Amino acid sequence: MTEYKLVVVGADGVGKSALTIQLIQNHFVDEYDPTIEDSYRKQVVIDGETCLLDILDTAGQEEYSAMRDQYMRTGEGFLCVFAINNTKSFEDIHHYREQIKRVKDSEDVPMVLVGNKCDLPSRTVDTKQAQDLARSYGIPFIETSAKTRQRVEDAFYTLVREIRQYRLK
Ligand SMILES: C#Cc1c(F)ccc2cccc(-c3ncc4c(N5CCN(C(=O)CCO)CC5)nc(OC[C@@]56CCCN5C[C@H](F)C6)nc4c3F)c12
Ligand SMILES: Nc1nc2c(ncn2[C@@H]2O[C@H](COP(=O)(O)OP(=O)(O)O)[C@@H](O)[C@H]2O)c(=O)[nH]1
Ligand SMILES: [Mg+2]
């Protein structure tokens, strides 16, 4: 089948692991060990094509070695996650895009911006603000909830679609 290497990045506690496990195992996990970095795979049909998603749920220490660079560089698309009730996680997005562009050595990298925890009442990041930033980046923006599963498939499948477009260009 066709393989897609997805990488999930973003500040600690934005819901990277919860989103990944929601997509793979269809249930909400709270208090998942924040230090554990793992790859999860799933076979799915997206727009008529059988895909093998290979999803890197990033964690561990913030380290910039040639090795780590090389590892990140094998990612084909990046899910850039912030939490809508954490403004700092949103302003961290610039930094992750910067690192992704650096190791991919390109301004054109399949990416999707994700505003997670849209189930919460205490929003601090306007939907419109994230939409506009995403538009400046030239990428899709989706609001998700790993807790309720709202738009979780949308987010990941949108990234697959972006990688697919990149491959055909
Ligand atoms: C992420 C990422 C990343 C890419 F997306 C692309 C290429 C990369 C190349 C080298 C390194 C990274 C990368 N590594 C991890 C990273 C990481 N981790 C990993 C996961 N963490 C936890 O899960 C908490 C408990 O452990 C802690 C912080 N954190 C950051 O940014 C964190 C901040 C806060 C303090 C300073 N630092 C710079 C900004 F200000 C935000 N970047 C990472 C990075 F770019 C790349
Ligand atoms: N209400 C709500 N809480 C969430 C959501 N996603 C994650 N969380 C909680 O936020 C905390 C951090 O989630 P986690 O997936 O470990 O974040 P990570 O550090 O980015 O991997 C956990 O307690 C989760 O239960 C969400 O969509 N809604
Ligand atoms: Mg985690």
UniProtKB/Swiss-Prot annotation:
Its EC number is 3.6.5.2. It is found in: Cell membrane; Endomembrane system; Cytoplasm, Cytosol. Changing residue 34 to R: In CFC2; characterized by a defective GTPase-activating protein sensitivity and a strongly reduced interaction with effectors. Changing residue 38 to A: Decreased interaction with MAPKAP1/SIN1. Changing residue 60 to R: In CFC2; characterized by a defective GTPase-activating protein sensitivity and a strongly reduced interaction with effectors. The modification N-acetylthreonine is found at residue 2. Ras proteins bind GDP/GTP and possess intrinsic GTPase activity. Plays an important role in the regulation of cell proliferation. Plays a role in promoting oncogenic events by inducing transcriptional silencing of tumor suppressor genes (TSGs) in colorectal cancer (CRC) cells in a ZNF304-dependent manner. This is GTPase KRas.
